[model samples]
Target: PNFSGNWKIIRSENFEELLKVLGVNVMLRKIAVAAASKYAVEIKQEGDTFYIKVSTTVYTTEINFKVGEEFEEQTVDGRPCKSLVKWESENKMVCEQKLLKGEGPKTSWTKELTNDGELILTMTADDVVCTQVFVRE
Candidate 1:
């Protein structure tokens, strides 16, 4: 449940659907589909704090946050947002992000460690919910 390990996105069940829900363009979607499976993730945890680094041949992004912490996030794909995160359970984390420049309500993301050794990342916004699964390396 610590989730402190090297991980990789092998095959996502609803990744493309989630990308569409995020309003990603078709061109970007094509690129994302090709790149997503190859991306690797490194996660480090100390107490209640976590550092997640996502790396791919094209780009790399890192996020640092602690349980119950609030932070500002400028999304790489698009939009600027403010985010708050909390630990909902031992292996589940919930996040709410508000987009400042978009005409919509806030977005929510819930991440949980699955029994089948997959990390399920779910996002919801404006009544749309999408989930992506990742496996530890």
Candidate 2:
């Protein structure tokens, strides 16, 4: 379980609508949905610490955080938050985000790596769940 490679974006379902629920503006939402080719994620792990970088045609977000520690983070739509990530099991990590503005879901997404090395991201907000499926490169 190295979890240290590029996860190429394969497909996303209702991502722009999820962004809209998080209060992203119409124009930004359009940009994110307009092109799907540039959405990619690179993850590198050093022991307990993980560095994750996700970038697309419109915006890029990078986070370096350790399990069970709190850190400041901004949402993909640029909202500020205090976030904590913890491992649920061997290859599963869940994140809880407390938005400074008190918006969106408290428990966000969980990162899971499949046996075939596919990364499945499940994100939830306002009772709506969106899944992004990726394959290892």
Candidate 3:
């Protein structure tokens, strides 16, 4: 997958449920899952490394990663996790994250580019799943 463009969120399903399963506080969940909130993602690749920048209504953050390597990453709620990214197919990328120090639900997500040119982000925590759709901007 090229996966190297700015993507703006179009819609989301089960996001609040996923956040609740992840143990996010009610206040933050409310803000994060609010229909009016905006989220966008920008992806850039150079050689074997990928940089993903996430912008939200409240803040912006970026992470750099290479496929098959484990890196320390901060979760959306601020916990440190050991994360790994890998390609599942020509059009799908997957990431897994486990807490680096304490017990927590194993988190994973898939970024898939559809033939129709939409980006689908599927996030999982414990048994909860959330799907967010995005369109290239």
Candidate 4:
């Protein structure tokens, strides 16, 4: 999938559980979870380059990168990590993130597009996995 569109977050499950397993700061986890359903995402793709912008009433950030290229990205909590994205298939995109500081488990995000018109983001770290679903506007 091109993954170029405006998406609105609708539902999420086990997000805090995954954050806890990843050792995220307590306050940051709480803050992120608070806007679980209030954020909007804009994704733009131009050939091999991609840009993702997340916006909410309280916070906003943007990141740009190309598939298969390693880049640095900051988490919503402000943790820096080296990240890479790749296409697993036509409908699935996988992103791997490795922490640049401190000891942390390997983390990744898998974005899957469903035929029913929902985008599901599966977040994984070590053995924990959580999902957040989004619908195009």
Candidate 2 global lDDT: 0.80
lDDT of the structure predicted as candidate 4: 0.83
Pairs of residues at least 3 apart in sequence or in different chains that clash in candidate 2? none
TM-scores for all predictions: 0.84, 0.87, 0.91, 0.88
Q: Candidate 1 versus the native: TM-score?
A: 0.84
RMSD of 2: 2.0
Best by TM-score: 3
Q: Give the per-residue lDDT digits (tens) of candidate 3, residues 65-94.
A: 998999888865578998998889888889
> Pairs clashing in candidate 4?
none
Let me know the TM-score candidate 4 reaches against the reference structure: 0.88
Q: Write the per-residue lDDT of candidate 2 for residues 20-116, one digit (tens) a residue.
A: 7878799888876766556888999987798999887776788889888998887656678888988888888888888888656544878888887
Residue-level lDDT tens digits of model 4 in 1-137? 56789999999898888888867788988877887779888988787688889898887889899989999996434679999999888778899887889766677888887888888888887887888899999
Assess each prediction's global lDDT (C-alpha) against the native.
0.76, 0.80, 0.85, 0.83
Quote the lDDT for 78 in model 1.
56
Clash-forming residue pairs, model 1: none
RMSD of 4: 1.9
35-119 per-residue lDDT for model 1 (tens digits):
8778787889888888989888988878888888887765435577877888888889998887777565446778788777888
Question: Which lDDT value does model 4 have at 90?
Answer: 78
